[PDB]
């Protein structure tokens, strides 16, 4: 992904 | 003559390396997807989604690629778009790394940055708006659901693993982002070569949506630090039916493991690589997996 | 079974890609040394210098590697040292990139940073001091003069090129840093396979010490921006005898060319890659080289 | 190299 709906 | 017509064709044939300070007597082997154009696994799906759009006529000279991606997919599409001569627009939050913005600009991307408060939803929304404004002009490849994603894994990634291990591979561990890697790999080894390996999905303990779903519990996503994985949903490119086991890993351990790969194994892998190895190591140290050859996807480089 | 015992063995087998916006009808092909452990050509000499020191008994369990290197050699040695379980000290000016310091620290290097005003001379000096303080403990591999540098190029890099082109390679263009690449490659193709190709060294117009020497002029080095090349001297690992031609390239053009590789070819190469291509393009557009297959080393990634 | 006695 890189970010689906999360991350950092 | 082994020359590639363009950089898109040069994907894959990534190496297997044995870990010396993980697992039991070298039962843990890593597949280094860092050794690819654009320095990640996403090079494969970037190449194949474009190739497929070309074959089926959805992508022609003149039409533009649009995709929402905060991560390596954007980089992959940028490289391929440059290699094959397409314009490309990428949407993501203003809240990105300046290095990624600059490298993406360097690669010839028309960059469209959406509100950081609105997150990836804002970036999908905007991408959808852009395509809607001129449907004849713009094509969204839709990485989360496009079958050309797991297909490339079934055609290349998996067969590489089969070949490299003389079919002795017993377990494949892979973090899930789009789900394409685990999907395609599992389909190749189990369906095409016909070996009943154990396919292990990895996801953050912070956002264990696969585990919660399979347990019949309420799905409760959360933020985490392991880039590439933990979408907060089950992607259409994740084939639940081929998943044998789901391991959760925490951000800190994934990070510690990534650092250990570097310092102890001399391998430059990203945090999600750390996650994959942490999970593999856990299983590798169960007697039940002591005599199993465990292959771990390292999705990207540091 | 195609599994590597450690990350050091995984060097090379880098791809050839045809350029579409350089040369004449695809007579220019690039060898992407970015597709390597540690993201550069130096992975090869890093591996082989260590391997050789092991075979000849200069490097054993307990002894430490020391080397002065401001660049990719340090990164390469760090990776291999981690992969093979050696301590390593690297010396360079305090005037380095924080990313390199941090990545080198991440890799387990004992970092020793010398005065920035004193430059690389200060870093050689300090490295020499450290070895002198305990000669039984420390081993300097000496990248500029160690034969294991060009040897690895003669054994791997060159044969890969021969193989990939069915021996149809006519010209090899390579920037000179240590000189090992051009040396080893040329020796393989000309001596071992016996084809009389044209070996083209590249160096900065800002510091054209090879050109000046061959012209019998006073050697007049200068600073430049093309990292990896232009030492300001002729290295012992540069075999003048196999060099057919020397092309000079300026910093700005090398940089513009690197950017064009990215934006037009979808190839992520460093400034020295730009230099190599700029030089190759020049020759490729002379009628005399119109029907020659030109292979260009891209030493590193962006 | 990275710097022999030049660069930047």
- Annotated catalytic residue C302: no
To one decimal, the resolution in angstroms is 2.8
Angle at C202 between CA C196 and CA C204, to 5 degrees: 165
* Min Cα separation B83/chain C (Å): 4
B-chain residues near C106 (CB < 8 A): 259, 262-263, 302
User: Locate tokens 């991440």: which residue?
Assistant: C106
Dig out the tokens for C132 from the structure: 């002198």
Instruction: Say yes or no for a CB contact (<8 Å) between D2 and C230.
Output: no
* Sign of the dihedral defined by the CA atoms of residues C64, C65, C68, C71, in that order: negative
C contact test, residue of B81, B268, B269, B274 with most C CBs within 10 A: B268
Instruction: Say yes or no for a CB contact (<8 Å) between B165 and C3.
Output: yes
Whether C34 and C40 have beta carbons less than 8 Å apart is answered as yes
Q: Report how far residue B257's alpha carbon sits from residue C98's, in angstroms, rounded to the nearest whole number.
A: 23
Half-sphere exposure of C153 (CA within 13 A, CB side): 29
List the domain boundaries for chain B.
7-39+147-298, 43-140
Look at strands C28-32 and C16-18 and give their pairing.
Answer: antiparallel
Q: How far is CA B193 from CA B45, B185, B294, C112, in A?
A: 22, 11, 17, 52
B-chain residues near A3 (CB < 8 A): 70-71, 92, 119-120, 227
Of C119, C143, C229, the CB nearest to D5: C119
List CB contacts of C205: < 8 A, sequence separation 6 or more.
C248, C249, C250
User: Locate tokens 């394409």: which residue?
Assistant: B180
B100 contact C CB<8A = no
Dig out the tokens for C48 from the structure: 């082989």
D-chain residues near C224 (CB < 8 A): 6-7
What is the CATH architecture assignment of B7-39+147-298? 3-Layer(aba) Sandwich (3.40)
Whether B54 and B210 have beta carbons less than 8 Å apart is answered as no
DSSP B146-210: -THHHHHIIIIIHHHHHHHTTT-EEEEEEE-SSSHHHHHHHIIIIIIS----EEEEEEETTS-HH
Determination technique for this entry: X-ray
- Annotated catalytic residue B163: no
Residue C199: helix, strand or coil by DSSP?
strand
Task: For residue B295, list its beta bridge partners.
Answer: B29, B172
C-proximal residues of B, 140-179, CB under 8 Å: 163-166, 168
CATH topology of domain C43-140: Rossmann fold (3.40.50)
D contact test, residue of C38, C67, C70 with most D CBs within 10 A: C70
Residue B298: helix, strand or coil by DSSP?
strand
Exactly one of B31, B42, B126, B292 is catalytic; name it. B42
Q: Report how far residue B267's alpha carbon sits from residue B14's, in angstroms, rounded to the nearest whole number.
A: 14
Distance of CA B9 to the CA centre of its chain: 18
Residue B230: helix, strand or coil by DSSP?
coil
DSSP B99-117: HHHHHHHHTT-EEEEEPTT
Q: Which of B214, B64, B72 is nearest to B137 (CA)?
A: B64
* Min Cα separation D6/chain C (Å): 5
* Min Cα separation B165/chain C (Å): 5
User: Locate tokens 């079974």: which residue?
Assistant: C1
A-chain residues near B223 (CB < 8 A): 6-8
Of B166, B265, B301, the CB nearest to C7: B265
User: Locate tokens 């959760």: which residue?
Assistant: B248
Whether B190 and B196 have beta carbons less than 8 Å apart is answered as yes
Q: Which of B67, B106, B71 is nearest to B230 (CA)?
A: B71
Q: How far is CA B62 from CA B57, B82, B137, C280, in A?
A: 12, 14, 7, 31
Phi-psi category of residue B227: left, alpha or beta, with phi > 0 → left and psi -120 to 50 → alpha: beta
Phi-psi category of residue C244: left, alpha or beta, with phi > 0 → left and psi -120 to 50 → alpha: alpha
As a whole number of Å, the CA-based R_g of chain B is 19
C266 contact B CB<8A = yes
Of B10, B78, B267, the CB nearest to C7: B267
Q: Report how far residue C10's alpha carbon sits from residue B94's, in angstroms, rounded to the nearest whole number.
A: 38
Domains C7-40+147-298 and C43-140 share a fold: yes
Distance of CA B288 to the CA centre of its chain: 28
Q: Report how far residue C33's alpha carbon sits from residue B261's, in angstroms, rounded to the nearest whole number.
A: 22
Task: Give the start-end residues of each E strand in chain B.
Answer: 3-4, 16-18, 28-32, 64-68, 88-93, 110-114, 138-140, 169-175, 198-204, 245-249, 293-298
Half-sphere exposure of C223 (CA within 13 A, CB side): 4
User: Locate tokens 């080894």: which residue?
Assistant: B189
C contact test, residue of B1, B3, B9 with most C CBs within 10 A: B3
Q: Report how far residue B96's alpha carbon sits from residue B120's, in angstroms, rounded to the nearest whole number.
A: 11
The CATH number given to C7-40+147-298 is 3.40.50.1100
* Min Cα separation B226/chain A (Å): 7
DSSP C30-42: EEETTSSGGGBTH
* Sign of the dihedral defined by the CA atoms of residues C256, C259, C263, C268, in that order: positive
């Amino acid at each position: 992904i890189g970010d689906g709906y999360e991350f950092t | 003559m082994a020359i590639y017509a363009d950089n898109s064709y040069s994907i894959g044939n990534t190496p297997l390396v044995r870990l010396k300070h993980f697992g039991h007597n070298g039962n843990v082997v890593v597949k280094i997807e860092g050794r690819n154009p654009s320095y990640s696994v996403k090079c494969r799906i970037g190449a194949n989604m474009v190739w497929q759009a070309e074959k089926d006529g959805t992508l022609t000279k003149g039409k533009e690629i649009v995709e929402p991606t905060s991560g390596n997919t954007g980089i992959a599409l940028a490289y391929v778009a440059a290699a094959r001569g397409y314009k490309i627009t990428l949407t993501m939050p203003e809240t990105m790394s300046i290095e990624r913005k600059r490298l993406l600009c360097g690669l010839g991307v028309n960059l469209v940055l959406t509100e950081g408060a609105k997150g990836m939803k804002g970036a999908i929304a905007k991408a959808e708006e852009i395509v809607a404004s001129d449907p004849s002009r713009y094509v969204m490849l839709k990485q989360f659901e496009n079958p050309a994603n797991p297909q490339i894994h079934r055609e290349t990634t998996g067969p590489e693993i089969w070949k490299d291990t003389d079919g002795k591979v017993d377990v494949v561990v892979a973090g899930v982002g789009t789900g394409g890697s685990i999907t395609g790999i599992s389909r190749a080894i189990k369906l095409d070569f016909g070996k009943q390996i154990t396919s292990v999905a990895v996801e953050p303990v912070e956002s264990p949506v696969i585990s919660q779903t399979l347990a019949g519990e309420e799905v409760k996503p959360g933020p985490h630090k392991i880039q590439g994985i933990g979408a907060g949903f089950i992607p259409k490119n994740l084939d639940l039916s081929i998943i044998d086991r789901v391991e959760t890993v925490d951000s800190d351990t994934a990070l510690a493991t990534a650092r250990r790969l570097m310092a102890e194994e001399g391998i430059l892998a990203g945090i999600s690589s750390g996650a994959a190895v942490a999970a593999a190591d856990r299983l590798a140290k169960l007697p039940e997996f002591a005599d199993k050859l465990i292959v771990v996807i390292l999705p990207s480089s540091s």
